[PDB]
Structure 1
Amino acid sequence: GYSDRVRSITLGNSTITTQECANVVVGYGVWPEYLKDNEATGEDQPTQPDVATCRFYTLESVQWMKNSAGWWWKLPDALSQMGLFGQNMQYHYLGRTGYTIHVQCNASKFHQGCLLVVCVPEAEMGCSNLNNTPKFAELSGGDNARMFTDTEVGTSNDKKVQTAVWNAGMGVGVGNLTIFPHQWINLRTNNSATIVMPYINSVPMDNMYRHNNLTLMIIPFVPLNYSEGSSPYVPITVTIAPMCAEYNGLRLAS
């Protein structure tokens, strides 16, 4: 072992290599594995698809402004339109997978900032109006980032999610969000963040279009900054890889 700060990951067809990174946080202490034949209840045979599904699908990018609050994604839904993971997701009826989340954000030695890369299992949300429940087009984007705000929510539109960043939108203390697995991105000494998450859920296999497994949240606790005479555009990107996929219950598409 020489020069700890360099990693390398070759999963299937893609490879992501960082030179300046921290350690790798591996789930709750387990590596994602297939489903044993002692805990299954499906009566069909599964379908370990290919290397063609365990790949590195990169999602959209965004700009880290100087007033931005935070973004998030829904994991089983963000990869709905990507390659052969989005075809075996809708043609079948069941499935279980694990992911390998990644994040890139690189700045010079004259910038500053921080971020909290964390994934929350079973993330709920709260509508703006108390009586109603949130919409769907205001809860999940089509692999495009959803963003928090500074003002709380207003009183509209009776279905919008409440983007109150200091409460996280779930109704908890934002400082206590370090229980779920995570990693910090400090531009002083960091350039990325890796996270390996297994499949955590009550039932053995669950639908993909009806119930979202996890939720990826990004929150900058310390805003960007820089003196005059430097690049004012700092973008962010994320790369995710389905790990150990399986399916059951073949039907027509939807």
Structure 2
Amino acid sequence: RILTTRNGHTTSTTQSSVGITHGYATAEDFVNGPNTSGLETRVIQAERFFKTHLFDWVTSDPFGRYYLLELPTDHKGVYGSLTDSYAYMRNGWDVEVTAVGNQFNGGCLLVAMVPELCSIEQRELFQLTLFPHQFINPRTNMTAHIKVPFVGVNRYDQYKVHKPWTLVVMVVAPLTVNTEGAPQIKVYANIAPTNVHVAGEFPSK
């Protein structure tokens, strides 16, 4: 039930989590390859949480609204400065998507961290439970907390061009404010980069 996760100097507590969904691996692969010549360093100051707004769940939305965002998104803090001050870098992800409703709102919600994609057709939605996923069901839980490692074609990636992961939500069953439930839900996210490495330095202005 109760579960407290901590990344860096930031924490988070949830009292209804149904577990963590490790995806595609438990540990990361070898991070000192032959391409970087050993000129790579591991920054630890940039493994803290940060937040964003996805959308607002509402009764009008039928099955199949996804509203996906691709990340690494723009970042005010430290991790946002690394892609500006370094060429190649790699990092996993540790998401947490929260939708606080009520004990009495029926409906469902599916969230999965899928690899590289731009758009999904309506037929492929029925098969979204192949990627690391978790259901948000307002009768029981309110947080997802998927946990995926870095994966890509080549070892170190240039985040100015290739965005490998893409957090995807989806309304499996419509919201129903039957009698006493909250009129609408506002979905948020609590992503946090984990295990960030970085190599190759830029000349400033």
TM-score by length of 2: 0.90
Match of 2:36 in 1: 42
Match of 1:158 in 2: none
1:103-252 alignment, distance < 5 Å:
103-125=97-119, 166-167=122-123, 173-227=124-178, 230-252=181-203
Distance (whole Å) between structure 2 residues aligned to residue 192 and residue 209 of structure 1: 30
2:111 and 2:168 in contact (8 A); partners too: yes
Summarize deviations over 1:143-190 as a string: whole Å, max 9, x none.
xxxxxxxxxxxxxxxxxxxxx6x24xxxxx211111111100111111
Shift of 1:252: 3.4
2:102 and 2:181 in contact (8 A); partners too: no
How big is the alpha-carbon RMSD for the aligned residues of Structure 1 and Structure 2?
Answer: 2.0
Distance (whole Å) between structure 2 residues aligned to residue 72 and residue 26 of structure 1: 20
Distance (whole Å) between structure 2 residues aligned to residue 120 and residue 90 of structure 1: 25
Match of 1:98 in 2: 92
1:62-81 alignment, distance < 5 Å:
62-68=55-61, 69-76=65-72, 78=73, 80-81=74-75
- Give the number of the structure whose residues are more often strand, by fraction: 2
Shift of 1:237: 0.6
Q: Matched residue pairs, number?
A: 202
SS of equivalent to 2:78 = helix
Pairing partner for 1:83 from 68, 77, 81: 77
TM-score by length of 1: 0.74
Shift of 1:208: 0.4
Shift of 1:91: 1.3
Distance (whole Å) between structure 1 residues aligned to residue 85 and residue 25 of structure 2: 32
1:18 counterpart letter in structure 2: T
Pairing partner for 2:21 from 22, 25, 36: 25
2:66 and 2:169 in contact (8 A); partners too: yes
SS of equivalent to 1:222 = strand
2:76 counterpart letter in structure 1: M
The answer to whether residue 27 in structure 2 is matched with residue 55 in structure 1 is: no
Shift of 1:75: 1.3
Summarize deviations over 1:207-239 as a string: whole Å, max 9, x none.
001011111110011111113565313211100
1:119 counterpart letter in structure 2: M
1:232 counterpart letter in structure 2: P
SS of equivalent to 1:57 = coil
Distance (whole Å) between structure 1 residues aligned to residue 24 and residue 160 of structure 2: 25
SS of equivalent to 2:81 = coil
Shift of 1:125: 3.1
- Structure 1 segments unaligned to the other structure (5+ residues): 127-163, 168-172
Among all aligned residue pairs of Structure 1 and Structure 2, give the percentage whose two residues are the same amino acid: 26
Distance (whole Å) between structure 2 residues aligned to residue 113 and residue 253 of structure 1: 51
Distance (whole Å) between structure 2 residues aligned to residue 21 and residue 232 of structure 1: 23
From the superposition, tell whether residues 189 and 253 of structure 1 become closer, same or farther in structure 2 (CA, over 3 Å): farther
Summarize deviations over 1:17-39 as a string: whole Å, max 9, x none.
1011112111113234661x3x3
Larger of the two Rg values belongs to structure: 1
Distance (whole Å) between structure 1 residues aligned to residue 153 and residue 30 of structure 2: 16
